[PDB]
Amino acid sequence: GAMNSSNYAELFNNDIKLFVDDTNVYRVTVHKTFEGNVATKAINGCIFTLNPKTGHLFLKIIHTSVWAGQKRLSQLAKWKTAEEVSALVRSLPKEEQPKQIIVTRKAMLDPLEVHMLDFPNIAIRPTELRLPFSAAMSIDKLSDVVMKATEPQMVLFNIYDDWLDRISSYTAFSRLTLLLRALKTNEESAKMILLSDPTITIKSYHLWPSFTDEQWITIESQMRDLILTEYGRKYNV
């Protein structure tokens, strides 16, 4: 059923599973029209489809042309998401197809279930975790590839870089969710933390800086401080 704190280690077992986050599929800027009315302008979006065990992020970039001439775009966005996830599963070899797909928002359940009727053995599940995957567009290289796209395109990222050489997938996921929660709560501060020191670089083929184990502990502590700080600043505590 629903994925929560009670069954959190299930994410890192050997049953293939994918998280699907649709929070950046339909993105707009709201602005005033010459007549003083309000209108939206869409910008490129993305589906965030992640294997939490391996770190594989199947980033389908959603080009603004997919919305041209369409109505009820927030509803269409959920069905477009489900169509693209179903197309991804069908493109994978059988032994690579997930056994479960966990959606981060419950409104994706029915669209994905209907698109996956051909796959009765793949379980479509909600989660009670509040995962910070919306912040994926705060990762510079992911944001860059989405905004530059001129056509629909699938970008193939490992969101853990090489961390699994040194840590388990439970620890890697915890690090990712901490980084993304921080970027979501105060993006400027979070990015200052990650890049303050010019001697720690991001490899061309990575998303995050090449921190030593000791520097990651420092970094991780700074992100928790930031999150607690903002939680004070926010609630005044």
Add this chain to the structure above:
Amino acid sequence: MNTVPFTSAPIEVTIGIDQYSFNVKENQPFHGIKDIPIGHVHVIHFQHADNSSMRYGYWFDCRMGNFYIQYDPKDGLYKMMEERDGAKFENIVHNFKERQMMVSYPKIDEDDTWYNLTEFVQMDKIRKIVRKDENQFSYVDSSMTTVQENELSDPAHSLNYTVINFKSREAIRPGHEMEDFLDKSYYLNTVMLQGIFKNSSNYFGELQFAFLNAMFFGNYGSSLQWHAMIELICSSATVPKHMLDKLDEILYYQIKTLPEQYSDILLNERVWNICLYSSFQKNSLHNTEKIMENKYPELL
């Protein structure tokens, strides 16, 4: 005007005939029901005084044979039977009528309720939902499950209603996922009406039969079927205008007849609020919406 003779009434029982109900005492000199209107199906149903568990009953049409009721002390219920000897039967009925041992179907002349609840219900279709081909009448009770219920356990004793499932390949054309899920017209008009039912009369007949089994026996799977068939029409943007007008009349008389004190169990809040206030046909059911709002404003 036809007659159903009772051999006797050995156990205290409430007997209902369509929307009417009456009490018979243990060993009371009761020998059946006369003046039953020809031209309609009917249902004669039972609730024992000592065990309100299991309402049960029989759907029948007096044009199809001579039927009578006899209590079976081994199986513990009133059973319908067919009398093949026509002169024996006429003679039994005549004697019981002469002794005024039969109650009279109390049809008020102004009253079209039963017609309006069974307009599209035919015995032959009942007998395909309820499979027991050696009899011309059909037994139903409170506990019988539907084919769809058994998919989610004795098949011989099932209600074989037409399976409706909105998240099924039958309901959803490959490549029309969003279209077909948000607008069920394809599934209503092509799959069910053209494909399975053949016409709207057969669809309405199953809808009406399902409601009546829900109301008279508390049959939960029948209630599910009734709501599913309503929801499939209301969730279709494209429905023949004659079907919508007839549906409004059908539901009006079902809501009018429903006991007020059974609304909590026999009406699904989600389906009715969706159908009357959110669906494509939210504006097409004036008579049903008006009686629902005056009679069950709480549900809404």
